[PDB]
Amino acid sequence: DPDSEAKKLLGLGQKHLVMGDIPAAVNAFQEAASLLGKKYGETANECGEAFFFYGKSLLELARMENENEEEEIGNLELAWDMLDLAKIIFKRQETKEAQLYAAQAHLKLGEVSVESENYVQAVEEFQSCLNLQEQYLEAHDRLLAETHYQLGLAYGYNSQYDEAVAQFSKSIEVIENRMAVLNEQVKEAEGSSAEYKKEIEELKELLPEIREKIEDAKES
Amino acid sequence: DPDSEAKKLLGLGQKHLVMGDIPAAVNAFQEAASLLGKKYGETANECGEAFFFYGKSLLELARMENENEEEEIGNLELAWDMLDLAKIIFKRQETKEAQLYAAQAHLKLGEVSVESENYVQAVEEFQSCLNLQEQYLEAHDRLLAETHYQLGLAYGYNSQYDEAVAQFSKSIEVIENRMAVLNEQVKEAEGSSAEYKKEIEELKELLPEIREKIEDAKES
Ligand SMILES: [Ca+2]
Ligand SMILES: [Ca+2]
Ligand SMILES: [Ca+2]
Ligand SMILES: [Ca+2]
Incomplete structure (x- = not known):
């Protein structure tokens, strides 16, 4: 497809994430986001993933920078703009995978809000994420534990300590x-392994x- | 249901199988078979399992007895009669489970044929079993290996030694x-077990x- 030229950069950015080279992942994501946005518009399905990753990387890029104060400020405002676009694109689509992406966009919007000393908004965003996840995840999904933890943190930053304890x-x-x-799954897997070894013998x-x-x- | 009184004996026979008490399993199966046959007729679905187990036990009961020669002869003729009824009942029904039961009835008909020094008929019955199984089992099901082995034996008893080698x-x-x-399944199960243990930690x-x-x- 003609999009391949940009999907390439989607790889080369995510690679750099697992490499730890942040401003390179930022430039990769920015280029892919610009390409997809020019082609398909500012709210197209085709741009969801792109706008999310750009946003996420920008957040990380503002975390590295911790009088260069306007640097992280501008990176956080852009992180917010991109993640909010991503969130709109994802929430529009009526499929479990898209809704969980939307929850992820919310989660990162909460993290950007935290890095901006904006804890009330952080609480709103983490709540939105948790609400979406409780519709589609099993009650022991790791993700729910991590959302509750982030929500409890945000509560604490805002001095709502009883709410924070509740979430923790x-x-x-x-x-x-x-x-x-997981313990049950271990017992099952090891039982099966023993069965198979015995039949092999x-x-x-x-x-x-x-x-x-x-x-x-x-x-x- | 009113059949419970007989399903009871179906348990008490199979129990005795895993107990090794053969003539008791024979009497249990005979009573259940008589009950179900009186109620539902000589060819009813309701009697399939019953007539099979009776048949199978009779075969075992004639194997124990190895001038009491008419004893095992009569037990083998009855084994045959009951297993053939079972086979008709099973083959009539258009479901995978019933067809594999029919293959099992064929397999035991082959074993009765072997115990009667009737190796041509044995070959026919084992072939019927194998034909049914190759429609519904995966190419590595243990059952196929056991059928090929029985077929090869029967061939050998009849001095068709090249056919026997082929089946072996x-x-x-x-x-x-x-x-x-099975080795692949072991590797997979142990990999999963390691994953779960690491997440637990x-x-x-x-x-x-x-x-x-x-x-x-x-x-x-
Ligand atoms: Ca703005
Ligand atoms: Ca402390
Ligand atoms: Ca007869
Ligand atoms: Ca030898």
Whole structure:
């Protein structure tokens, strides 16, 4: 497709994320975002992912810079603009994957809000994320624990300490319930592994008897 | 249901199978078979399982007895009669589970034929079983290996030694391919178990940081 030229940069940015080269991932994402936005418009489905990653990287790029104060300010305003576009694009689409992306955009909007000492807005954004996730995730999904934790943090920054304690406790509850589920999955996987190993041994000790029957049939 | 009185004996027979008490399993199966046959007729779906198990047990009961020669003869003729009824009942029904039961009835008809020094008929029955199984089983199902092996045996008893070698080799091929598949399943199960254990450890080392944040929020 003609978009490939930009999807390339989507890779080369995400690569740099796992590389830790931030301003390079920023430039990659910016170029891909500019390409897709010029082609398809400012609100197109085609730009959702692009605008999100650009936004996310910008947030990281303002975190690195911690009198260069207007630098991180401008990076955070742009992070916000891009993530909000992303959030609109995602929330429009009626599929579980898009809604969870929208929740992710909300989560990063909350993180940008936190980095701006804007804790009330942070609380609103994390709540929006949690609301979306509770419709589509299982009650022990790690993501819910991480959202509760972020929400509790934001509450604390705003001195709403009882609300903060409540969210921290919910986070702990999810983490413990997930640990239980994972323990069950371990027991199951190891049981199956034992079953298969035992059958393997049975088959192995069957083979040479058959081979001797072949030998005996040939000499007959 | 009113059949429960007989389904009881279906359990009490199968129990005795895993107990090794054969003539007791025979009497249990015979009583259940008589009950179901009186109620529903000689060819009813309701009697399939019953007539099969009776048949199978009778075969075992004639295997134990190895001038009491008419004893095992009569047990084998009855085994045959019951298993053939079972086979008709199963083959009539157009579902995978019933067809595989029909293949099982064929397999036991082949075994009765072998115990009667009737190797041509044995070959026919094992072939019927294999034909049914190759429509519904994966190419590495243990059952196919066991059928090929039984077929190869029957061939050998009838001095068709090249056919016998062919079937033995097919049996070996299935056993080796199954061993491969099981090895892959082991690798997968153990990989998953490692993943889950690692996530468990991460969650465990997350918990006390959250707990300290709760403590700090309360004292605030
Ligand atoms: Ca603005
Ligand atoms: Ca030998
Ligand atoms: Ca007869
Ligand atoms: Ca402390």
